[model samples]
Target: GPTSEGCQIIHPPWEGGIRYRGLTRDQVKAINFLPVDYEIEYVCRGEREVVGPKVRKCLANGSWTDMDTPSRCVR
Candidate 1:
């Protein structure tokens, strides 16, 4: 199983909105909506190493995109 700590988008694509410009170590969770142009990297903690996604996005009417890659924390 995955750890309680996962990865999340620490920054948005732009400099406005709910955008941030730093590391967000909190676990990624479900969100209702996000800016259609949102995209960023996410760092996840793995059993033997740290993992991260090259790119992730917040769709206009759907959950976060680019989840095709399996999370390292999963067994």
Candidate 2:
């Protein structure tokens, strides 16, 4: 990932911005970079999909959390 204007990159043994309950930064450092679903404790946020496909689906089914809040790739 590219470094932002003020924040420097987290060196080896660190996963920038990755947080999990009860897991220290280093402990997750060596874990596999795989996708897994889990419950999110905070709020999810984002805008409509680049196109209308995402927003349309959410409105139609009401199954997506984004319908009530933002479109975030959260837990």
Candidate 3:
């Protein structure tokens, strides 16, 4: 069998004004996955505004390429 590296990005407890679209905490924890090229899109809460990139990607090195740019929606 072949194996590859991926990231298991999770949600922060302080995730208030943002909601994740692609990946979720419990789901990811169950699968323990997120292969390379996979991405997660986060959406800002209605009416509120957001800061930084809302999309994130899983890299080949089992890490997230969404460095620096983060999705943290706020008023």
Residue-level lDDT tens digits of model 2 in 1-75: 942222122232311132244445556455432222222222123322221222212112213234232234423
Ranking by lDDT: 3, 1, 2
Clash pairs of candidate 3? none
Candidate 3 TM-score versus the reference: 0.56
**Runs off by more than 4 Å, candidate 2:** 1-16, 33-37, 40-75
TM-scores vs. true structure, each candidate: 0.36, 0.22, 0.56
Q: Please name the candidate that would achieve the greatest TM-score relative to the true structure.
A: 3
RMSD of 2: 15.2
lDDT of each: 0.42, 0.29, 0.61
lDDT of 1 by residue, 1-75 (tens): 832322343333322222233425363345434456466543343323224354666565454576564434322
Q: Higher-lDDT candidate among 1 and 2? A: 1
- Steric clash pairs (candidate 2): 46-71
Q: Which residue pairs come into collision in candidate 1?
A: none
**Ten consecutive residues with minimal summed lDDT in candidate 1?**
12-21
User: Which whole-number lDDT from 0 to 100 does residue 40 have in model 3?
Assistant: 65
**RMSD to the native, candidate 3?**
3.8
TM-score of 2: 0.22
